[PDB]
C-alpha cells in the first residue's frame, strides 16, 4: 500500500543519514526544513553535499539558512556539483561559498566562467589562486567584471600587492570604498608606503588583514592611530574628492 | 481534486516568494492587488524584476502603483528587459525609472532608440552619460526629439555647461521654461556669466543644483537675492518676450 511504502522509504532515508554521520536531532531538523520536498529529494541533495566533502554538521547549516537548495532539480544539481569540483571547490571548500553565495547552484555557468576567465587571464591569477579566491571571497561571482578588474588593479598597481598576498588576505571580498578609505588614509598619514621597484619599503606596511578585516575602531586604534572624529571627516573629504573626477 | 491542487500550487508560489526575500504581509500584497491575471504571470513578471536587480520592497511599490505591469506578455517583457540591460538601465538602477515613468514597457522600441540615438550622436554624450541621463531623468523618453535637442543646446551653447556637469546636475529633468526663467533672471541680474572661450568667468557662477533643483523661495533668497514679487513680474515679462517671435 502507499502508506507502508512511505514508512519504508522514511526508514531507508533515516538509516542512510544515520550511516552518513547525521545525528537524530539533525535528521528531525532536516525533515522539518524540507518545504514539501520529497524524502529522496532531501537525501539526494544531502548525498551531493557529502560527496562535495562537507561534513554532516555544516550540511545542516547550509540547508537551514538556504532551504531553497532542496528545490533544485537533482540532475542539474549533480551537473553543477561536478562543475564546481573540477573548478577546485571540492573537499569541503564549498562550505563558505554556500553560506554567503547560495545562488551558485542557480547561477548560469558562463557567468561563473566569465569571473574565473577575468581572474585567470586578465588579472593573471593561477588556477590554485582562483580556487582560493572563490572559496574565501564568494562575493566576486556577484561582482561586475569591470568593478572586479579595477579592484584587482588597485591592489596590484596602486597599493603594490603581489598576487599571493591579495589571495591570502581575502582582499577581493571588501568594497572598493572601504579599501580606498583605509589605504589612502594610511598613505597620507605616512603609515602606508607604496612598494617599488623590488617590492620593498623603508618601513614595513601593516598587514592587509589589520587594515581591512579588522573593525573601524581597531583599525584606528592599532593601525592608523588617530581619533574616530578625524577619520569621519576624512571619509567625507575623500567622498568629495572622488565625486569630483 | 482541483480545490486541493490550487491550494498546493498557492503554497509553492508563496514558499518561493518567502525564499526570495518577501516577508509577513508583503507576500499577501502581491496576490490581493492582482486584477484577473494568471498566478504564473504574477511570478513571471516579479521574477524578471528581481533579475533586473530590484529588491523585494520596491517590487511591491512599483506593482501597487502600476498594476498594469502584470497585464504585459512575459515574452515581450523579456525582450524589453534584455534591451534595457544592454542600455545600462538594469543590474539595480531601475527604481526611480518605473516609479516616475511606468509607460516605458508599453512604449515603442524605436521611439526609445531615437531618444538614445539623439543623445549619443547629436548631443555627443558618452554611453556611460546616456545611461545616467535615463536613470535620473526618465521624463526625457516622453519628451519630443526637437524639444530635448534644444534643451541640451541651451545648456551647452547658451549657458556654457560641459557634458559631465549637465549629467551630474540632472539638468534634463527640468522644463525649458523653468531653466530659461532662472538662467535669464540671473544673467540679467549679473549673477550668471556665460563662460568663454576657455570655459572661465570673472566670478564663478552658482551651482546648477542651487539654480534648478532648489525651491523658488531658496533660489531667490540665496542665489538670485531678490524679492518674490519682483521675480513674479520677471516671469510675466519673459513669457511675453518668448510669445513674440
UniProtKB/Swiss-Prot annotation, chains A, B:
<dbReference type="GO" id="GO:0005762">
    <property type="term" value="C:mitochondrial large ribosomal subunit"/>
</dbReference>
<comment type="subunit">
    <text>Heterodimer with NSUN4; this interaction may be required for NSUN4 recruitment to the mitochondrial large ribosomal subunit.</text>
</comment>
<dbReference type="GO" id="GO:0019843">
    <property type="term" value="F:rRNA binding"/>
</dbReference>
<keyword id="KW-0496">Mitochondrion</keyword>
<feature type="repeat" description="MTERF 3">
    <location>
        <begin position="127"/>
        <end position="157"/>
    </location>
</feature>
<dbReference type="GO" id="GO:0005739">
    <property type="term" value="C:mitochondrion"/>
</dbReference>
<feature type="region of interest" description="Dimerization with NSUN4">
    <location>
        <begin position="228"/>
        <end position="245"/>
    </location>
</feature>
<dbReference type="GO" id="GO:0006355">
    <property type="term" value="P:regulation of DNA-templated transcription"/>
</dbReference>
<feature type="repeat" description="MTERF 4">
    <location>
        <begin position="163"/>
        <end position="188"/>
    </location>
</feature>
<dbReference type="GO" id="GO:0003690">
    <property type="term" value="F:double-stranded DNA binding"/>
</dbReference>
<feature type="repeat" description="MTERF 1">
    <location>
        <begin position="60"/>
        <end position="90"/>
    </location>
</feature>
<keyword id="KW-0809">Transit peptide</keyword>
<comment type="function">
    <text>Regulator of mitochondrial ribosome biogenesis and translation. Binds to mitochondrial ribosomal RNAs 16S, 12S and 7S and targets NSUN4 RNA methyltransferase to the mitochondrial large ribosomal subunit (39S).</text>
</comment>
<dbReference type="GO" id="GO:0005759">
    <property type="term" value="C:mitochondrial matrix"/>
</dbReference>
<keyword id="KW-0677">Repeat</keyword>
<dbReference type="GO" id="GO:0043010">
    <property type="term" value="P:camera-type eye development"/>
</dbReference>
<protein>
    <recommendedName>
        <fullName>Transcription termination factor 4, mitochondrial</fullName>
    </recommendedName>
</protein>
<keyword id="KW-0698">rRNA processing</keyword>
<keyword id="KW-0694">RNA-binding</keyword>
<comment type="similarity">
    <text>Belongs to the mTERF family.</text>
</comment>
<feature type="repeat" description="MTERF 2">
    <location>
        <begin position="95"/>
        <end position="122"/>
    </location>
</feature>
<dbReference type="GO" id="GO:0006364">
    <property type="term" value="P:rRNA processing"/>
</dbReference>
<dbReference type="GO" id="GO:0006390">
    <property type="term" value="P:mitochondrial transcription"/>
</dbReference>
<feature type="repeat" description="MTERF 5">
    <location>
        <begin position="208"/>
        <end position="236"/>
    </location>
</feature>
<dbReference type="GO" id="GO:0006626">
    <property type="term" value="P:protein targeting to mitochondrion"/>
</dbReference>
<dbReference type="GO" id="GO:0005829">
    <property type="term" value="C:cytosol"/>
</dbReference>
<dbReference type="GO" id="GO:0007507">
    <property type="term" value="P:heart development"/>
</dbReference>
<dbReference type="GO" id="GO:0061668">
    <property type="term" value="P:mitochondrial ribosome assembly"/>
</dbReference>
Amino acid at each position: 500500500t502507499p502508506v507502508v511504502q512511505g514508512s519504508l522509504e522514511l526508514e531507508r532515508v533515516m538509516s542512510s543519514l544515520l550511516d552518513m554521520g547525521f545525528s537524530n536531532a539533525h535528521i528531525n531538523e532536516l525533515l522539518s526544513v524540507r518545504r514539501g520536498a520529497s524524502l529522496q529529494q532531501l537525501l539526494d541533495i544531502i548525498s551531493e553535499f557529502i560527496l562535495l566533502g562537507l561534513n554532516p554538521e555544516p550540511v545542516c547549516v547550509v540547508l537551514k539558512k538556504s532551504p531553497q537548495l532542496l528545490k533544485l532539480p537533482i540532475m542539474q544539481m549533480r551537473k553543477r556539483s561536478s562543475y564546481l569540483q573540477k573548478l577546485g571547490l571540492g573537499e569541503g571548500k564549498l562550505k563558505r561559498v554556500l553560506y554567503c553565495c547560495p545562488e551558485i547552484f542557480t547561477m548560469r555557468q558562463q557567468d561563473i566562467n566569465d569571473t574565473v576567465r577575468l581572474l585567470k587571464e586578465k588579472c593573471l591569477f593561477t588556477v590554485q589562486q582562483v580556487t582560493k579566491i572563490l572559496h574565501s571571497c564568494p562575493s566576486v561571482l556577484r561582482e561586475d567584471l569591470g568593478q572586479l578588474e579595477y579592484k584587482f588593479q588597485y591592489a596590484y598597481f596602486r597599493m603594490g600587492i603581489k598576487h599571493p598576498d591579495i589571495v591570502k588576505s581575502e582582499y577581493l571580498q571588501y568594497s572598493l570604498t572601504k579599501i580606498k578609505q583605509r589605504h589612502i588614509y594610511l598613505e597620507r598619514l605616512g603609515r602606508y608606503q607604496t612598494p617599488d621597484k623590488k617590492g620593498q619599503t623603508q618601513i614595513p606596511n601593516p598587514l592587509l588583514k589589520d587594515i581591512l578585516r579588522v573593525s573601524e575602531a581597531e583599525f584606528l586604534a592599532r593601525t592608523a592611530c588617530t581619533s574616530v572624529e578625524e577619520f569621519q571627516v576624512f571619509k567625507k573629504l575623500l567622498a568629495r574628492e572622488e565625486e569630483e573626477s
